[PDB]
Design a protein around this nucleic acid. Structure first.
Lengths: 63, 93, 13, 102, 77, 46
RNA sequence: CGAAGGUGUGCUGUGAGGCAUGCUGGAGGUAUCAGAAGUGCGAAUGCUGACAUAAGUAACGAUAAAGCGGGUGAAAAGCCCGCUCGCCGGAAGACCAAGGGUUCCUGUCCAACGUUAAUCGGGGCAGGGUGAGUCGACCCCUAAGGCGAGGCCGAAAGGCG
RNA sequence: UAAGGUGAUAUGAACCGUUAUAACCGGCGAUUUCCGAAUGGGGAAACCCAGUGUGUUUCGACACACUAUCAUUAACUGAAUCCAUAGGUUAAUGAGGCGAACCGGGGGAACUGAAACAUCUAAGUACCCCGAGGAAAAGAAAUCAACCGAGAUUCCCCCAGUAGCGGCGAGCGAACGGGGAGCAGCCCAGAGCCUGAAUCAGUGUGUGUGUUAGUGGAAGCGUCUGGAAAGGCGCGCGAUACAGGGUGACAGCCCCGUACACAAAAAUGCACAUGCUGUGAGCUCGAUGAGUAGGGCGGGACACGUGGUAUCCUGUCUGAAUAUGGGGGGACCAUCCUCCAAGGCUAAAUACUCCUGACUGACCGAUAGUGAACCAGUACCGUGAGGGAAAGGCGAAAAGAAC
């Protein structure tokens, strides 16, 4: 899940980041606070995924 | 433009308590946790978009973390900000 | 530990 | 470069029951391994009102130093050491004293 | 400070000895004065805090030469 | 019996505060000494 | 099949000491001959820790004051409720600023803390609680005063403005 | 590298991975909030308030970038007066702050000693300030010597508690010369002939070596005591590996290591060869450092306290010759000998360790050793600078005592 998205264009990279932030990051957080989340390992996994996308954007845009 | 992602990070979690429950059933207002800065405008926009509800006004306050005496050591909790959001006649959550 | 916000809150007399 | 692995049948050289055979289940970062029916401890498990109520006395497995267990040859009927050699570009373990690959 | 702008003379500490050879710290000060020198190259007066020895130096050499050395020194005059 | 210490946050900060020390070189040496000693509190912080 | 250390006993040398051993101890010790010393403590109103004495003595912090019934509890003079009594009332009431920094409220516990007991508490643990266009800060303006581009002065630091 | 992992107190819950993108280690990258030289302005440090320029969902409002001071350079503007200068704006370059000691320079004590005390000593010490480096400073004779000779500076052992200085008291204390470590000499004050002509500094390439991850690494069994043996007893094997650490009592042969032999995609220091850039070889002639040397006055430094006092530096006032000239050779003069000041550059031997790795100890073993073996410069005390503790040990394994 690192080189799969390396070759995509910047437009899709921004799109996938938005849905990563939108869903599975905000929704998971609300679920965990309310106590309805039992698989807490998704939170860390989603956070790392967001970091991966941002790393690609910087090495794509500008430099 | 990072307004969309900003709105996705200001909200942290809902607040559950007796005061929260009575406020919801009586004043039709939701109390929830927000980021440390979380200006009133950002909270208002975030609730309108993420929760797809109409809001009237937002009141915010900062809660100071308590000092706890854990084991042989003294510690302090982190300050957090809670906001009261007053929904209009139409409420969803 | 250290609190740094001794802001004034004067209730109207 | 660990001589004792997840799935190995080993024997005990020194301890409460030397010469007893078994199979390792896990290895700890502190050079300790867990085997079946070798080092049994009658732990007094307290009762808890949570979902689990074991109570009574539980016969648990106690970890033993990896140095006290040697992989069994299974052919010569005795304990034997482990060495590493490179074959077809891969590092593999082998016995000694007529060494064969594992 | 009491520093000549030409020769660089600055106050120097020393002792003063009485008849009984008692030694007390003193300070020797250069004979500084403020003087206006006329420069024909630039056609105006330049004020320098120069010592009496420095004024003799200016007379012996040219005012233009001294100014050039001051400029090379890197201090505005 | 009025005692010597009469607390006042404004006077304490303006007298022994971090910015007061940095104003003069002597205060800067005070901070330098306390950094060397490893003190957790460099100065009286509000 | 038991080292050092600890604790008794019995022998031994004119002495500081040595030897053997009972019990505890639990893994180190060291002959002889030489070598080097942070090499020997009863005192220094010695230093640190521990423990005695006075002694179960003085004291328990304003002489405004308590009494009873019921409740809870293992236990009630002190906690809760009720009825009386007494005290302050330009305060011992109600508000702030400064200063404290959760001491606020609820549930629960009584080890330590409370100069006594304690079910009680400003004590322990957990949870909850601080909502502003109009209050204040922030912000605009300035006093004493501070800092101070250039500048003046000063061995350097720096002083004054 | 890998069959294990998601740092610790500290278990749990929910999961990843097991033949390769789980985790871990190393190189090179990305992100890097706010305070702090803090640098857009301000400020009670981690806060408040802006201007301009770039792009965008309801005008709403957002995102990014820039905007300190000083020095130098260039451009454009620009007074009192024509010109001009001062001044102003803009752009580029450099600096700012911190850091244990060592180095150079600018200032500079007192206690104390002299059995008092003032010269003197302590002492150019403590301390304050400035500047730079990995070292710094000094350094190629206007030096010594003795009329015999050596040839930059620096450091160590002698000379030597010697000669001298000294209320000739207390004390201070050389040089010449000798033995060692290490050695390197140059450039400008200027023209001509010849002009990459050696040596240097900065950027590419290639070899070797080293650092930043690592890999393999020999050889033991049976009985006795025992909670457990690595111990006793008996018989074996390895050693270019019995250095260490761990393992239920003391292990060369159980484990990690050790001697030994190997390893680098990428980044790097060192020594060479090969390219580019910039100053620059060699010969002839000439020149060869002036408010300086020296002197008067007042001080300081040389072991040398003004004494018969040479030599050097300087505050003040004066002031040559310039190579047929000048300096020194311890008052001074003559004769001889030696050198050529008033302009600069220069590694080596030398000093120290905030920090990194390995190794060692007739060093300590918890009132010792760093104040700190235990999240200590903490708790605590003080307005503040500052001061500053106590506290280690279950067991082989929690098997930490169900009932």
């Amino acid at each position: 899940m690192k080189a799969k998205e390396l070759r995509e264009k910047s437009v899709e990279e921004l799109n996938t980041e938005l849905l990563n932030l939108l869903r599975e990051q905000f929704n998971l957080r609300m679920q965990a606070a309310s106590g309805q989340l039992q698989q807490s390992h998704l939170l860390k996994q989603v956070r790392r995924d967001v970091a991966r996308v941002k790393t690609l954007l910087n090495e794509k845009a500008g430099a | 433009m990072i307004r969309e992602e900003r709105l996705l990070k200001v909200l942290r979690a809902p607040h559950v308590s007796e005061k929260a429950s009575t406020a919801m059933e009586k004043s039709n207002t939701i109390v929830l946790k927000v980021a440390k800065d979380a200006t009133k405008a950002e909270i208002k926009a975030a609730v309108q978009k993420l929760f797809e509800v109409e809001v009237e006004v937002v009141n915010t306050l900062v809660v100071k973390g308590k000092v706890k005496r854990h084991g042989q050591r003294i510690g302090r909790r982190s300050d957090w900000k809670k906001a009261y959001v007053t929904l209009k006649e139409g409420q969803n959550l | 530990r250290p609190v740094y916000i001794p802001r004034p809150r004067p209730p109207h007399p | 470069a660990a001589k004792i692995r997840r799935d190995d049948e080993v024997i005990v050289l020194t301890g409460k029951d030397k010469g007893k055979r078994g199979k390792v289940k896990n290895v700890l970062s502190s050079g300790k391994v867990i085997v079946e029916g070798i080092n049994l401890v009658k732990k007094h498990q307290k009762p808890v009102p949570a979902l689990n109520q074991p109570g009574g006395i539980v016969e648990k497995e106690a970890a033993i130093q990896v140095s006290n267990v040697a992989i069994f040859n299974a052919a010569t009927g005795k304990a034997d050491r482990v060495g590493f050699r490179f074959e077809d570009g891969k590092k593999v373990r082998f016995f000694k004293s007529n060494s064969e690959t594992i | 400070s009491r520093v000549c702008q030409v020769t660089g003379k600055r106050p120097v500490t020393g002792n003063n000895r009485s008849h009984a050879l008692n030694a007390t710290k003193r300070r020797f000060l250069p004979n500084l004065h403020s003087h206006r020198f006329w420069v024909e190259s630039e056609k105006r007066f330049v004020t320098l805090r120069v010592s009496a020895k420095g004024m003799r130096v200016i007379d012996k050499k040219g005012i233009d030469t001294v100014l050039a050395e001051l400029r090379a020194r890197g201090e505005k005059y | 019996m009025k005692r010597t210490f009469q607390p006042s946050v404004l006077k304490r900060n303006r007298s022994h505060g971090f910015r007061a020390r940095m104003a003069t070189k002597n205060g800067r040496q005070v901070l330098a000494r306390r950094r060397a000693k490893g003190r957790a509190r460099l100065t009286v912080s509000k």
